[PDB]
Design a binder for this molecule. Structure first.
Ligand SMILES: C=CC1=C(C)[C@@H](Cc2[nH]c(/C=C3N=C(/C=C4\NC(=O)[C@H](C)[C@H]4CC)C(C)=C\3CCC(=O)O)c(CCC(=O)O)c2C)NC1=O
Ligand SMILES: C=CC1=C(C)[C@@H](Cc2[nH]c(/C=C3N=C(/C=C4\NC(=O)[C@H](C)[C@H]4CC)C(C)=C\3CCC(=O)O)c(CCC(=O)O)c2C)NC1=O
Ligand SMILES: C=CC1=C(C)[C@@H](Cc2[nH]c(/C=C3N=C(/C=C4\NC(=O)[C@H](C)[C@H]4CC)C(C)=C\3CCC(=O)O)c(CCC(=O)O)c2C)NC1=O
Ligand SMILES: C=CC1=C(C)[C@@H](Cc2[nH]c(/C=C3N=C(/C=C4\NC(=O)[C@H](C)[C@H]4CC)C(C)=C\3CCC(=O)O)c(CCC(=O)O)c2C)NC1=O
Ligand SMILES: C=CC1=C(C)[C@@H](Cc2[nH]c(/C=C3N=C(/C=C4\NC(=O)[C@H](C)[C@H]4CC)C(C)=C\3CCC(=O)O)c(CCC(=O)O)c2C)NC1=O
Ligand SMILES: C=CC1=C(C)[C@@H](Cc2[nH]c(/C=C3N=C(/C=C4\NC(=O)[C@H](C)[C@H]4CC)C(C)=C\3CCC(=O)O)c(CCC(=O)O)c2C)NC1=O
Ligand SMILES: C=CC1=C(C)[C@@H](Cc2[nH]c(/C=C3N=C(/C=C4\NC(=O)[C@H](C)[C@H]4CC)C(C)=C\3CCC(=O)O)c(CCC(=O)O)c2C)NC1=O
Ligand SMILES: C=CC1=C(C)[C@@H](Cc2[nH]c(/C=C3N=C(/C=C4\NC(=O)[C@H](C)[C@H]4CC)C(C)=C\3CCC(=O)O)c(CCC(=O)O)c2C)NC1=O
Ligand SMILES: C=CC1=C(C)[C@@H](Cc2[nH]c(/C=C3N=C(/C=C4\NC(=O)[C@H](C)[C@H]4CC)C(C)=C\3CCC(=O)O)c(CCC(=O)O)c2C)NC1=O
Ligand SMILES: C=CC1=C(C)[C@@H](Cc2[nH]c(/C=C3N=C(/C=C4\NC(=O)[C@H](C)[C@H]4CC)C(C)=C\3CCC(=O)O)c(CCC(=O)O)c2C)NC1=O
Ligand SMILES: C=CC1=C(C)[C@@H](Cc2[nH]c(/C=C3N=C(/C=C4\NC(=O)[C@H](C)[C@H]4CC)C(C)=C\3CCC(=O)O)c(CCC(=O)O)c2C)NC1=O
Ligand SMILES: C=CC1=C(C)[C@@H](Cc2[nH]c(/C=C3N=C(/C=C4\NC(=O)[C@H](C)[C@H]4CC)C(C)=C\3CCC(=O)O)c(CCC(=O)O)c2C)NC1=O
Ligand SMILES: C=CC1=C(C)[C@@H](Cc2[nH]c(/C=C3N=C(/C=C4\NC(=O)[C@H](C)[C@H]4CC)C(C)=C\3CCC(=O)O)c(CCC(=O)O)c2C)NC1=O
Ligand SMILES: C=CC1=C(C)[C@@H](Cc2[nH]c(/C=C3N=C(/C=C4\NC(=O)[C@H](C)[C@H]4CC)C(C)=C\3CCC(=O)O)c(CCC(=O)O)c2C)NC1=O
Lengths: 164, 177, 375, 177, 146, 164, 177
């Protein structure tokens, strides 16, 4: 969807012209950044249900009020729904790491998020707490390389900005 | 529309699967021959006017019934129409070659093209020949074996991309058939 | 952004810099138009609230583009100046067309052709003629989307119909120019739940407008006519002619064997010896592709149905007229030496030498003889 | 469009008959329970957000195939779409209950709704369930025996209006069936 | 097991398969102008279009036979009862043989690269085994309509 | 004008959104291609009136008919106008070598070229002969580097395609 | 609009001069710190929501006359208006920082902004303060000495870009003054 290639083809198509020299000049930027983002993608993929385990609980540590009766988490199955809800965001961030743009984020998790969580009484603050706790726990020796963490954190704080 | 990187996420989204290191090497290979695809698209769009004017005249000079009155390429306006009717085809195959898959020409150019040429009275088998000549010229160009004009390249193989632009050109044949 | 009260940007005509913005909206067209008494009233800038003027723009120039709050900030930047009174609703619907959120579902998602139909339906409320598309694809492909969306707003039809202060809406004008542009307009604009996003192609007016003949179906252009203009015809009679239509309007059923390219095929009883009707006229379609690889060459085969082409057959009949008026042969009493059709007949021999012994073959067949004009 | 008072004049206009005192008592009865219909429409539109969010979640939690990938209510955008796709239905049934007959939702909301959901790929039997939950909630509300929240009313009968809102709710059951 | 010469031979047919049917039906008229005559069988586009389709069918049916290298598919869903449907439709059985022999004479000219209008670009050699095999296939289909 | 940066900012502006990650991903492609195109630009610039001298005359060698009376070249001053006309195209190609896109070519030489040369009887074939003669005279040892000649020829044949 | 590479060709076009190796090293330097500008634009747009919400609330909490009735930021709609009225400003300064010169916000955002706020009755000196706070936050972010949240960077100098985004923010001050 909203990738690097699908802006330069849609601009040339809306102008109604051939793929010009600046248009293939921008696909060269993929060759230098894919080596950084694809290795971030599968270090995310091979470790993925760990960072729902050690980070989906941080919202409940920050917001223990929503385990009360009459709240967003009543029983255990709603907590399972919460872990499923945040695992979906972790999957979409992996999809945007491989695409090269924020294409899979917008229409799959972001577009429409404002109404559901308002209508179903889900607080976005508990979402961005769990996302931000995953953001600041990144470091160069253990987690990934120096350039993987950069846009891995950039795709995270994009979601943080869009949810707020 | 959809590029080659975005083709695998809509396949992995159908199973709710993370894209992992088991299918990433097919993408990294696609990135590794980025310059080969890139110079090939450039070699297509460099000589694109003779590519169109040669193909339409070659389609004419084998079937000279279109030039006769009552032909579909008879008058001056209809020849101006046909010279662009295939230039758009080349313009969208150049998009599909750069994007890495045949999604950008299938719903934009090819969707609804059949009944357009049926309702106007365009002979489909003549347009089949006209795009086959363009396919032959394409594999002549991006393999650098055009006997008519040579371009300089770094040495290596390019047939993997030459079969790609061949598989784009029969989709334009099938959608009009 | 540009002026606290503006009239018309880009100065296409010279006479628009003198032209002031209209102080009061343009009135109705002076024809009588019997349908208009049934249709709800127009929505101008003066009478509407800012809630309903936005709802009616989203209902007409967007179809039902089905917009969220997070989607389309660019529509609302243009709305942020309309609500301030910077620009008219004419330049506002120009600004909506140039936006990306209009592009990503109408220029983008659709094809080359019905994007033009989707522009006519969204801006002028109607459907174009074929010669109007003909001078419009030249604007769209060779001059771009920008001049194409500019060509509606600076058009006399838009200026005369909606002015500077009324939202686009479908107008019933009494006397129409063609009789076909009435019901093409009605067919292009159904009522609620229109959903231009649903059908990726519509495939129906894209072949009815594609030629000046072949007017579309009766029932599609009498479906969205208002109630009591068409009721007491829709209990049981045309109702099953309607649901059997709307089933085919789902998935964009193609009209290749229907309304265009119609061909009365021969009776099945005339070819029962040959094959069943589910497989007659299918033939293998072979594509052989050469590339200097061996790893990457390919061959493809597929049986495909081959329709007869009436356009190519009509050209061939016009070409063969020259042989019709050039005589056949002289005759005389000596014809008794050539009893049948054996005048100028001869045996054709073909001899098939090949490497295998079993596949050798000898011919003889008797047939006519004619020399080609190149020899 | 057409209200209940305007329904009898289009019936009398078909015979060129004056509306007289032989059929006027049926409308005078309709005027007599004006406050009952009026408080009922208010009781519908008072708690209308939980009415929608409960019904679609109840339609979800019985058929959890829509939440699976490839489901029609899978992604976040399509769930935002479905939450309004039934809110419009409730919004038009509230019009039809106030107007007194099912003419305002018949050509405005229901005309063309079937092929829209067919061309979109919306599962019709799921939308059948989603609107029958809304019908059950409606007869719970306007009879004031919602065990979940009670509203104060003057005492009396309201079942004549409760069958009315039931007969409105299978009309869009029938229209996309 | 003739690999490359077979694939070069089918390519010389299916590429220029669009000329060959239109040249053959014009040659079919070129002998007999009473076919386009009022009362003829090659009257208006109801019938002229079916002629172009039918000339195309028997053309292609031979290229798959040549690709497979044998005449099995030319008798399976091709030919077992093509004569009697033609006498049931009332086509002239004489000029159909002429139309078939124009295809033969053109295919044997395309394979041997002896076309006066278009010189093809091949590898150096001689396709004498395949120029006669398509003649055998075309006689197989000419023996049927007789 | 039509550069690499002015598509990615206009797309983000027409969408009405911040410069996203794919947007700064495409400016990285400038860092790898500018080193090839800027050295092509000043080898063009320091040698420029040589390649009007030895290439503006090639159209007169190909088309000697237009030095006849009643033609596009009547006297010496029209031939000076012709050399000025082709030096302008050589300047615009240098401007597009430095910009990174075909921006300075479009509205400065190409947009409107179809009417002037039709109305003032100037044949475009003699223009593209002189451009094509400068295109095919490029080679790796003498003229420029291996990658300079690539897009130097690509900006030339773009003009060749647009004039025809 | 105009970027930094396209700024020198419109200067050389005024004298019909070829761009040569006498002014090319100023752009080769601009290319050399491409990654510094690139990470700086990313550091701006990463934390951009708190950048806006903090600045507007800081403009409020020093001048609490706007919250009083008759204030320009009094009601809920006008506060929603003002929260985006500066987000657009940040959105265009992010364009101008990436493009390398102040041409893209010059005629797109700033052209006609003065009489808009004059005709609407927006207090200009309050908007001066609101964009000054955004300038201070910008030089805090792209020098990585925001005491409030730290981002990781490669070591080096970035003040050449920090004066650039300062010179963009006084143009928004001058055009509204
Ligand atoms: C493709 C992307 C994609 C997503 C992001 C999610 C988004 C999402 N979450 C929920 C649904 C939910 N999401 C949550 C999650 C939370 N509530 C809390 O208490 C916490 C704040 C948070 C977990 C940390 C819960 C509890 C529900 C169920 C709410 C309910 O059923 O009432 C629903 C409604 C359908 C359902 O019940 O599953 C949707 C669309 N689903 C998707 O398909
Ligand atoms: C792909 C994303 C990804 C992550 C963010 C982590 C998430 C994560 N971190 C830790 C575990 C840890 N994380 C750190 C933090 C750090 N360690 C250092 O050497 C640095 C100083 C600093 C980088 C931020 C430390 C010190 C521990 C061990 C103690 C602890 O559990 O906190 C654990 C517990 C067990 C484990 O180590 O796996 C998990 C699940 N893992 C992942 O797969
Ligand atoms: C987005 C994709 C896209 C396309 C592919 C073209 C497709 C296309 N072609 C034509 C229209 C046409 N196309 C042709 C072309 C041909 N007829 C022949 O005999 C040859 C086989 C062939 C040229 C090689 C002709 C001759 C016409 C005009 C028909 C006529 O009026 O005589 C039209 C009608 C509009 C008009 O006539 O102006 C359209 C939509 N346009 C598009 O927008
Ligand atoms: C502005 C426009 C512009 C471009 C699009 C690219 C084109 C380009 N191609 C290659 C490099 C190459 N390009 C080719 C491609 C081919 N060689 C052939 O003999 C075939 C004819 C053709 C295949 C279709 C090959 C084989 C290489 C060397 C290997 C490789 O890098 O892929 C390289 C260097 C990469 C490297 O070799 O390390 C570049 C920069 N450059 C530019 O300046
Ligand atoms: C005036 C009356 C009126 C309506 C009734 C609605 C009808 C309607 N719904 C949708 C569009 C839709 N409607 C649904 C709804 C559903 N799909 C399901 O799986 C559930 C059964 C159900 C929710 C309960 C969904 C999911 C889409 C979007 C389809 C998609 O893009 O995935 C569209 C297409 C426009 C768009 O997609 O934005 C329209 C016109 N709109 C109207 O204007
Ligand atoms: C079964 C055996 C058999 C044949 C041998 C030919 C014999 C033959 N020749 C001609 C008819 C003819 N044949 C010739 C040919 C020639 N005249 C000359 O002076 C030269 C000797 C030669 C050219 C070099 C000419 C000129 C005509 C008459 C054409 C005319 O003027 O009407 C006709 C009259 C029918 C017609 O042509 O329409 C017939 C039956 N046909 C047969 O069916
Ligand atoms: C601004 C909003 C607003 C309204 C819409 C009306 C609602 C309203 N309802 C009633 C009055 C009434 N309303 C009801 C209706 C009901 N009682 C029940 O037990 C059922 C739950 C429900 C039927 C659906 C009945 C039974 C009466 C008394 C008899 C009658 O007047 O119809 C009356 C007084 C008439 C009278 O009793 O003489 C008024 C004014 N008032 C307002 O201020
Ligand atoms: C689908 C892919 C595909 C093809 C199109 C053919 C193309 C082809 N033919 C030959 C090679 C050849 N091709 C021919 C064929 C001919 N020579 C002639 O003079 C006649 C025109 C024609 C016979 C009708 C001959 C005689 C040879 C050499 C012997 C042989 O290799 O068979 C070769 C080997 C290298 C070469 O010589 O070019 C290839 C790739 N083979 C394939 O794999
Ligand atoms: C008026 C009466 C009339 C006819 C009798 C025929 C004329 C005709 N031409 C050819 C013969 C041919 N026909 C073709 C076919 C073509 N050549 C090409 O290069 C194109 C690709 C393709 C479509 C034109 C070829 C290649 C030959 C063999 C070479 C030749 O004889 O010209 C043949 C078969 C061999 C022969 O007996 O001469 C016939 C009967 N056409 C007519 O109109
Ligand atoms: C699998 C093998 C296969 C075929 C060979 C064709 C065979 C074939 N031909 C026709 C049918 C026909 N074919 C012709 C064609 C001709 N008549 C003539 O006099 C000439 C010989 C030739 C034109 C040059 C005509 C004129 C009709 C009948 C059209 C009609 O009048 O109904 C039909 C009847 C069905 C139909 O056309 O609707 C079939 C099955 N189809 C096949 O599926
Ligand atoms: C910024 C870009 C830019 C350009 C590309 C040129 C384009 C251009 N050339 C000419 C004008 C001209 N251009 C030519 C050139 C030629 N005629 C020939 O015989 C040859 C085909 C060819 C030279 C090789 C001539 C001879 C004139 C003068 C024609 C006349 O005055 O009648 C004019 C009209 C004004 C004038 O007379 O100078 C313009 C706009 N000028 C520009 O400002
Ligand atoms: C920036 C663009 C640019 C050019 C295209 C040339 C243009 C050019 N080439 C030559 C001159 C030449 N050009 C070549 C051609 C080549 N030499 C080789 O070693 C290769 C095999 C081949 C690359 C195409 C040769 C062999 C000469 C000398 C003989 C001659 O004048 O033709 C001359 C005459 C004097 C000179 O050498 O400068 C000029 C003006 N110069 C430029 O500044
Ligand atoms: C392309 C560039 C672009 C912009 C910069 C903005 C500029 C802008 N702002 C407003 C409109 C406004 N802007 C403000 C903002 C403020 N008033 C204050 O007291 C504070 C100083 C400041 C917020 C920090 C307010 C409050 C309004 C609404 C005025 C009102 O109706 O009360 C309007 C009128 C449109 C509308 O009201 O919806 C426009 C065009 N919009 C654009 O399209
Ligand atoms: C997808 C998003 C994305 C980006 C935008 C870039 C960001 C990026 N920055 C640097 C590299 C750098 N970036 C900076 C910039 C800074 N250092 C500071 O201390 C300041 C806070 C800040 C200045 C504003 C410096 C000083 C270097 C090292 C020198 C340089 O390359 O410029 C490099 C490596 C180049 C090199 O060092 O050789 C990359 C790739 N990478 C990505 O993956």
């Amino acid at each position: 969807m909203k990738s690097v290639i699908t802006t330069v083809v849609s601009a040339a198509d809306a102008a109604g012209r051939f793929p010009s020299n600046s248009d293939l000049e921008s696909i060269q930027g993929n060759i230098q950044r894919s080596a950084a983002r694809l290795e971030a993608a599968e270090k995310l993929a091979g470790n993925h249900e760990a960072v729902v385990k050690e980070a989906g609980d941080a919202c409940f540590a920050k917001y223990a009020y929503l385990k009360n009766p009459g709240e967003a988490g009543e029983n255990q199955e709603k907590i399972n729904k919460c872990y499923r809800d945040v695992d979906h965001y972790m999957r979409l961030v992996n999809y945007c790491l491989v695409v090269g743009g924020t294409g899979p984020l917008d229409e799959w998790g972001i577009a429409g998020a404002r109404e559901v969580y308002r209508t179903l009484n889900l607080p976005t603050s508990a979402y961005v707490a769990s996302i931000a706790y995953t953001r600041d726990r990144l470091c160069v020796p253990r987690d990934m390389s120096a350039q993987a963490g950069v846009e891995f954190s950039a795709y995270l704080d994009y979601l943080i900005n869009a949810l707020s | 529309m959809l590029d080659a990187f975005s083709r695998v996420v809509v396949n992995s989204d159908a199973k709710a699967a993370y894209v992992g290191g088991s299918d990433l090497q097919a993408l990294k290979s696609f990135i590794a021959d980025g310059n080969k695809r890139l110079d090939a698209v450039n070699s297509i769009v460099s000589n694109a006017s003779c590519m169109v004017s040669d193909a339409v005249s070659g389609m004419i000079c084998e079937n000279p019934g279109l030039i006769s009155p009552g032909g579909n390429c008879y008058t001056n306006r209809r020849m101006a129409a046909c010279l662009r009717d295939g230039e758009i085809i080349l313009r969208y195959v150049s998009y599909a070659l750069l994007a890495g898959d045949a999604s950008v020409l299938e719903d934009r150019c090819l969707n609804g093209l059949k009944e357009t040429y049926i309702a106007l009275g365009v002979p489909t088998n003549s347009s089949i020949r006209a795009v086959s000549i363009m396919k032959a010229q394409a594999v002549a160009f991006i393999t650098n074996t055009a006997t008519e004009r040579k371009m300089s390249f770094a040495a290596g193989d390019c047939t993997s991309l030459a079969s790609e632009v061949a598989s784009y050109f029969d989709r334009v044949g099938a959608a009009i058939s | 952004l540009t002026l606290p009260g503006t009239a018309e940007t880009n100065l296409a005509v010279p006479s628009n810099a003198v032209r002031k913005v209209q102080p009061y909206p343009i009135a109705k067209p002076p024809s009588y138009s019997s349908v208009d008494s049934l249709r709800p009233a127009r929505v101008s800038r003066m009478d509407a609230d800012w809630a309903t003027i936005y709802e009616q723009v989203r209902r007409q120039v967007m179809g039902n583009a089905y917009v969220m709050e997070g989607e389309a900030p660019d529509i609302d930047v243009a709305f942020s100046q309309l609500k301030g009174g910077n620009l008219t609703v004419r330049e506002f619907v120009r600004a909506v067309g140039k936006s990306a959120s209009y592009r990503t579902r109408f220029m983008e998602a659709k094809s080359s052709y019905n994007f033009v139909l989707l522009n006519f339906k969204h801006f002028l409320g109607r459907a174009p003629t074929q010669e109007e598309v003909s001078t419009h694809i030249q604007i769209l492909a060779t001059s771009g989307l920008e001049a194409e969306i500019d060509s509606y707003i600076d058009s006399d039809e838009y200026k005369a119909l909606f002015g500077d202060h009324v939202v686009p809406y479908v107008v019933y004008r009494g006397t129409y120019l063609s009789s076909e542009r009435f019901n093409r307009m009605v067919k292009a604009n159904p009522g609620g739940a229109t959903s231009d996003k649903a059908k990726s192609n519509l495939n129906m007016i894209a072949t009815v407008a594609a030629d000046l003949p072949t007017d579309a179906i009766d029932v599609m252009r009498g479906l969205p006519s208002p109630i009591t203009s068409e009721t007491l015809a829709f209990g049981t009679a045309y109702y099953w002619a309607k649901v059997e239509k709307e089933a085919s309007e789902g998935r964009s059923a193609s009209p290749i064997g229907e309304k265009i390219g119609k061909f009365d095929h021969a009776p099945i009883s005339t070819y029962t010896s040959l094959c069943s009707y589910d497989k007659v006229n299918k033939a293998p379609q072979i594509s052989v592709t050469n590339v200097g690889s061996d790893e990457h060459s390919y061959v493809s085969v597929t049986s495909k149905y081959i329709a007869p082409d009436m356009a190519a057959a009509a050209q061939m009949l016009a070409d063969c007229q020259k042989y019709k008026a050039g005589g056949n042969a002289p005759t005389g009493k000596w014809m008794k030496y050539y009893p049948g059709t054996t005048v100028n007949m001869a045996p054709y021999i073909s001899l098939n030498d090949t490497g295998s012994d079993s596949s050798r073959t000898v011919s003889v067949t008797l047939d006519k003889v004619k020399i080609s004009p190149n020899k």
